[PDB]
Symmetry: D2
Subunit: 324 residues, 4 copies
């Protein structure tokens, strides 16, 4: 009921134990190290709580406008929490490498891994063991978003039939581009345009040929199923329409989360290099540092497909108009 | 020690208990409410830890360049932590007023008060408390033991350059002001435009009134009693001196210390403002249970300069004279 | 052609240090010019966005598609304002003595400092309590409908307010009456006498709150007094949107109100940051200031007299629980 | 004298020309595109101005505590300007890819290149104007911040053999420290821990070989892993060891701000490359493949980090009690 009892500050403000102070050789900056890590872990619990509720909302065959708005609110909340965590790195960077060296002797996160897994970081790229097992077995946000995207209204052949209208629009647009390039007076400009239209033909081949798409998914360049990519492309085309404005905001927030997780990884790896360099006494070489540098690759970006959707764009007047 | 054992996550990640979930009427945003408050309390413990160490360092007759640098490191760390706490308000603002209304039924901080007291928020300024004996002892000690405001004043009073036998800054400053203002009167007398001439002469008179408030200790003492100033006359002399020679290596780090104290003060007001806007967005000026707009109006009164601890430091630029008017450093 | 497109031969030719001209150069004068010109470029952008939002609101029909574009442009202004608040610490890098060495070349302003800053204040809807092109600009910004006036007209036409249709205001008054009656009966059953009286005193405070909105004469008195700006029907529409903000129909109109409040808050955050910088550079008064009159004027701009959408901030005072709010039928 | 005359707003507020509005097919977001770019260019002119003054201050045989403080003020100012410019990307990201596509038909920076060159981005890792050609020529010929910082680092007091002789004392401290570590690892009761420590001490010996053998350092400079001269790296290491001492606190802050500038230029490059992919993808109509996008992704590599050596200085650190104490 009262502030301290409600927030359980007798439990929370009792979890700070400096091992340098315990060994009667105290290092002042060890308190900062503990608090910073515990602030991260509190916000990790919050991110997991939000993610689990969004997963339960996405694990339904019908996701109405009302549930969609609540998913957008919670994805945006996670975006704000991630920005706060990126800003916590410069606070720990206040500690000197020599101060850190004086308590390092007494020294990853279950919650960070649960976030990676629940978001959709692919594994091929006892209470704690059960938690990690369930986070890999149960559907991630990447899987649940794909199923949502696959059921996007406008994709069905009987209804709006977007993919078929898009292939036809592309064909007529590229034909008009070839005729325009043929009328180019300068020969150099004419050839540049014709070579460019050929590059466009290759781009559309990667989406209009399911075999080419499946090859890229197996290769690791794509994660999304063919139909989820169709739904994602459709939403990006009609994002200015009220029907698709909120679904697009959902995709946008997923990309913002992905980008912010990489911004944390980068800020963390720069802090590691400022504190202990590429290697230091106890590191056993630069293996740990080099591992952290490999987490900055696109193999760790979950919604990798969403970032490239603008490659497939056609002008407003080339896009098939909404009928319904 | 392993990660979870070192950080005591079995204790830390077990302090979250939603009373709406307990009463089988759960409100999802109650988890956010608890975590946000607990993140504030973790950083409050950090701020207190830093403040206590800076206080212990300032509680000495000799504060060398090396201790000064460590005080600046820790003050700057607090500045970063305060910016982080100002940014936590928009996260809680994500909660809707109707969601908050559904768990408010089950509902200030000892640590926030310890920060206010240790920084130097004067007990006689608080606009119109804790039953625990450990909490009562904490608040008693924070009021009895010297605050950062008291310790900084003693440091400022002992600033080398103030002593009459040595550099004698205050006497050289009064002489510089007198000659500068006389030269301004002669320059204003040769003004061709009559309107500009009178404006300059009226302006030089406003300057004379400013210097009266610092060169007459009785006028200063009146402002301290009035509440417009907190600093002792000699601490204000030292603060003014540091701001004049801030570009000199001797005074660059002391000036950075004053600057960080002002930044902390400004950031505490930025939190107070952000908090009061969030309170109005959640429950308005008054709501069912509030018993009027008393609580909201109290929070609006904490935005006044009666709550700014290093109030004197903000005004130091009012006493500034040009580079060519300032007495040069000899030693 | 990058340089030709952006007209960098015109843009990068507008920087002239008068200290360098007088053969007594001050390095930080370049920062002073660039910082001010960065502000003025973003002021031109804010005015451009505000004028387009005003044109979109100056219509009897504002569809979902135009509403979304208004929200995009209001949010863009919110980002530009946050960026301008962050430009103050860059100018605060300059020392007061460096500033003092070039301040001589500056003129103090006859009325408003920046024409563009005043055009923003006027176009948003501030009551602010010198050339023919500039005079015409400021005249038109005061005469033509501000964002405050145009938003009020939009709020007045909110679907759900009409008596023939949903009739929200009448259902709200009835819900309040029954809610407060239930609260009185609940307070009457309180065993502790101190708690019972607290609840009955509190219900009386609530009765007064609802009197200020359910009696148009009490509302009109507060508008004349300056405590409120909104018309009675605009406040009804604003209250309605805040009650059903979780419903898709009212989620975007609520986002529009939210962004207007964010802009208002950010303009006050700039005013505060600017006033702190002024005090760090020249104090409350300095040579040329002629007393602390200019500084004290800047401190008076921090009051709620300068907040345009003042009514929107207090809307949560009128809230009733989820189960007390009349359900949406249509 | 007056506000508009002083800031030349008749010139500044007249440089905005939308080509979509000119062609009677206006795109509202083109105004944002112009203003955002012009805001970048105004701050580029400021960064160049600060860099040129810091270069003039570093182009002296004597850099006293007073000049050092002014260099730190201006480096920290550039750090704030760079943070501001990283935050301008999300404002342009407000524009939709389809709105951008409707004016892209009417469409790098001389100032961005001048910053890259003046900071020290090596040309071994386009403009036909005569004024622009002279500018880029001079930015490559005149000493960059990387060259001038190296010269300053080389003359760091405490490195001279006659004086404090830091490098010789550091080699001796390392030798005794690592020997003590071997003796301590030999007495390890657990065999797994004993072997781990001995393997680790060997990794440390290889680290110190790269700094105590000038031939190994020169090989890394030629290989591209390092840029700094051997003596500049000695000075940089020395400052990082005694950063808590008043004598070295401000020189260390200077190195720290150079790394912050480097990191912020990479944060802009990353934010810019994400915005490009959100607007036009890896390739689009007119791009002629994904060459431009792939070029921008290659600018995120450590080949574009100027003060690359400064980031790794913590690899050479020894404990407080192992560092030779300051005498003077
Ligand atoms: C003094 C500063 C820090 C240093 C030097 C540091 C160093 C390292 C190193 C070397 C690793 C690689 C794994 C290993 O070899 O053990 C690592 C991983 C990790 N650290 Fe840090 N760390 C620091 C601060 C933090 C903070 C403040 C957090 C936040 C809670 C954090 C969270 C993690 C996580 C979650 C991983 C795993 C990353 C992944 O799997 O991609 N570290 N750290
Ligand atoms: C749902 C959001 C919040 C609301 C509506 C709210 C409301 C209030 C109110 C009405 C008061 C006045 C005292 C009273 O009458 O009980 C108050 C005081 C206070 N609250 Fe908040 N609060 C919120 C969030 C927070 C957060 C996140 C913190 C941070 C830990 C916080 C810290 C405080 C402190 C320290 C005071 C005392 C301020 C002073 O003495 O100057 N509040 N709050
Ligand atoms: C060196 C820093 C600055 C100082 C000391 C300063 C000082 C002042 C003062 C004293 C006034 C009051 C009007 C007068 O009596 O002349 C004022 C007004 C104003 N200044 Fe600043 N200023 C500074 C920087 C800026 C910047 C960077 C901007 C942004 C473009 C700015 C914009 C304005 C505006 C728009 C007003 C009018 C405010 C209102 O009407 O509410 N100032 N300034
Ligand atoms: C609509 C948004 C933008 C898009 C799609 C975009 C796209 C591109 C592309 C594709 C390139 C590669 C060169 C080429 O093939 O022509 C490039 C380079 C460049 N752009 Fe952007 N850009 C955008 C906004 C900006 C902004 C706001 C600035 C800031 C002034 C900027 C500054 C630059 C610079 C300086 C380079 C060269 C980078 C380097 O040499 O490392 N761009 N841009
Ligand atoms: O003072 C009460 C409160 C309770 C718990 C934490 C907290 C933080 N700030 C205010 N807090 C308020 C009083 C007003 C209504 C909402 C609860
Ligand atoms: O992996 C170790 C570690 C231990 C404790 C907290 C923490 C956070 N991130 C990494 N942490 C590192 C390994 C390298 C030296 C320093 C301890
Ligand atoms: O290189 C072109 C360009 C032109 C103008 C400004 C600008 C900023 N960054 C890149 N800019 C791009 C290239 C890709 C097509 C669209 C224009
Ligand atoms: O009114 C003067 C002024 C002139 C030029 C730029 C500017 C910005 N804001 C105020 N400015 C003030 C008056 C007081 C001394 C400092 C300049």
């Amino acid at each position: 009921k009262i502030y301290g009892e409600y927030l359980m500050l007798d439990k929370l403000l009792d979890a700070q134990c400096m091992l340098s102070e315990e060994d009667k050789r105290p290092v002042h900056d060890e308190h900062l190290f503990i608090i910073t890590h515990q602030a991260y872990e509190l916000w990790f619990k919050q991110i997991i709580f939000e993610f689990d509720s969004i997963r339960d909302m996405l694990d339904a065959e019908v996701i109405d406008e009302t549930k969609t708005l609540e998913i957008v609110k919670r994805l945006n909340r996670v975006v704000l929490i991630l920005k706060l965590l990126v800003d916590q790195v410069p606070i720990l960077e206040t500690m000197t490498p020599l101060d850190f060296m004086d308590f390092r002797k007494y020294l990853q996160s279950l919650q960070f891994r649960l976030i990676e897994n629940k978001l959709g970081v692919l594994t091929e790229q006892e209470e704690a063991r059960n938690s990690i097992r369930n986070s890999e077995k149960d559907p991630s946000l990447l899987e649940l978003v794909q199923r949502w995207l696959e059921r996007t209204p406008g994709l069905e052949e009987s209804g709006f039939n977007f993919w078929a209208k898009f292939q036809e629009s592309v064909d007529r647009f590229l034909e008009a581009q070839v005729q325009s390039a043929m009328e180019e007076p300068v020969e150099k400009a004419k050839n540049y345009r014709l070579m460019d239209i050929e590059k466009r033909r290759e781009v559309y081949r990667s989406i209009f040929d399911p075999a080419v798409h499946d090859a890229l998914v197996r290769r690791g360049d794509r994660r999304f199923s063919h139909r989820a990519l169709q739904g994602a492309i459709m939403i990006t085309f009609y994002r200015d329409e009220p029907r698709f404005s909120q679904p697009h905001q959902l995709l946008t927030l997923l990309m913002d989360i992905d980008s912010l997780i990489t911004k944390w990884r980068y800020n963390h790896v720069i802090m590691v290099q400022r504190m202990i360099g590429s290697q230091q006494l106890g590191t056993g070489g630069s293996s740990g540092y080099q591992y952290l540098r490999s987490t900055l690759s696109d193999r760790y970006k979950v919604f990798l497909d969403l970032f490239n959707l603008s490659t497939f764009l056609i002008p407003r007047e080339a896009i098939p108009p909404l009928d319904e």
